């Protein structure tokens, strides 16, 4: 018995014994009606280690616990550069909105205080629809989790004062349907420095502890105390080659004036994950810079028909 946890739902599947990661993943995506499968994965945690279900491996053969309800979390593994230009289906847009809002509220990704207020105002518009002073009276947001605790702890303001500031901006969002408000939330969130960045502990050749960030834009090297501003960045289209051999990675820039960057990473399983994230992020970087495939063109036409079908019922 396999339990699948999405950002807003829990499903149970009667998984076959001789089934591989691909079979379970495809079933989940079909059940959800999700066609942009390339962004997503099935994640699990064992003995303090985050891992993804391998598509070419048997589900039961994985290092996951042999607990009665074998559980995976369906989550986005890859992120678009501009969600407003790339995410086609409403289901995909909504799952990204939920996941990213959770990363902001639980402080997985940093957010300046002013952005947390503006983001909360779009989350309120998405959840409640248009602000209406007859309905949304003072105290209507008292039970909502609106801001990261880090932000609340930086100011001498009451919950009512935070609600008032959020409500001012919520009132400015009149006219945004749920999908429009959730997409405006993603448009703000996707410009945060930590958005979509996968961090890994590495060392340079002199032993200096650093972090590698793998993201939709390229590769980035950080001092461990500052995950916001890379010391050096290598955009995907500026990398000539990435080599890996015996725990050592080498990033070779296309620009000869930029030095080759070598670093080490201690865990083989993590190194395989770093390489997988490099290959697929580089592939997605190239794909979004070329004209839509016929499959994407048709997916957009179908999403347009679905949006117009739902709009006819409301009007």
């Amino acid at each position: 018995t396999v339990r699948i946890v999405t950002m807003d739902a829990e499903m149970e599947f009667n998984c076959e014994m001789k089934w591989k990661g691909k079979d379970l993943f495809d079933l989940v995506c079909r059940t959800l009606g999700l066609r942009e499968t390339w962004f997503f994965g099935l994640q699990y945690t064992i003995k303090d280690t985050v891992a993804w279900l391998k598509m070419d491996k048997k589900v039961l053969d994985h290092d996951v616990s042999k607990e009665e309800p074998v559980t995976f979390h369906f989550l986005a593994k890859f992120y678009p550069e501009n969600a407003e230009e790339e995410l086609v289906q409403e289901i995909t847009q909504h799952l990204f909105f939920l996941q990213v809002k959770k990363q902001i509220l639980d402080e997985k990704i940093y957010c300046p205080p002013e952005a947390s207020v503006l983001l909360a105002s779009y989350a309120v518009q998405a959840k409640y629809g248009d602000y209406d002073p007859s309905v949304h009276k003072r105290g209507f947001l008292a039970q909502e989790e609106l801001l990261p605790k880090r932000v609340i702890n930086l100011y001498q303001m009451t919950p009512e004062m935070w609600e008032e500031r959020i409500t001012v901006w919520y009132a400015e969002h009149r006219g945004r349907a749920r999908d429009e408000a959730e997409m405006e939330y993603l448009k703000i969130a996707q410009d945060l420095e930590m958005y979509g960045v996968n961090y890994f502990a590495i060392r340079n050749k002199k032993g200096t502890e650093l972090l590698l960030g793998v993201d939709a834009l390229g590769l980035h090297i950080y001092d461990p105390e500052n995950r916001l501003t890379p010391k050096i960045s290598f955009p995907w289209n500026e990398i000539r080659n990435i080599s890996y051999s015996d725990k050592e990675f080498t990033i070779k820039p296309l620009d000869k004036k930029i030095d080759v960057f070598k670093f080490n990473s201690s865990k083989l399983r993590v190194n395989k994950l770093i390489l997988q994230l490099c290959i697929e992020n580089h592939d997605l970087f190239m794909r979004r810079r070329k004209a839509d495939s016929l499959e994407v063109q048709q997916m957009k036409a179908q999403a347009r028909e679905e949006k117009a079908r739902k709009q006819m019922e409301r009007q």
């Binding site: 002013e114 952005a115 448009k187 410009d191």
Partner: peptide, 23 residues
């Protein structure tokens, strides 16, 4: 630019919060 068309609102929010900073 960072935060696209929301710079004006972000700066106004920054100004509204400033008097209450813990420091």
């Amino acid at each position: 630019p960072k935060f696209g068309t929301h710079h004006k609102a972000l700066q106004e929010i920054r100004n509204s919060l400033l008097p209450f900073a813990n420091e």
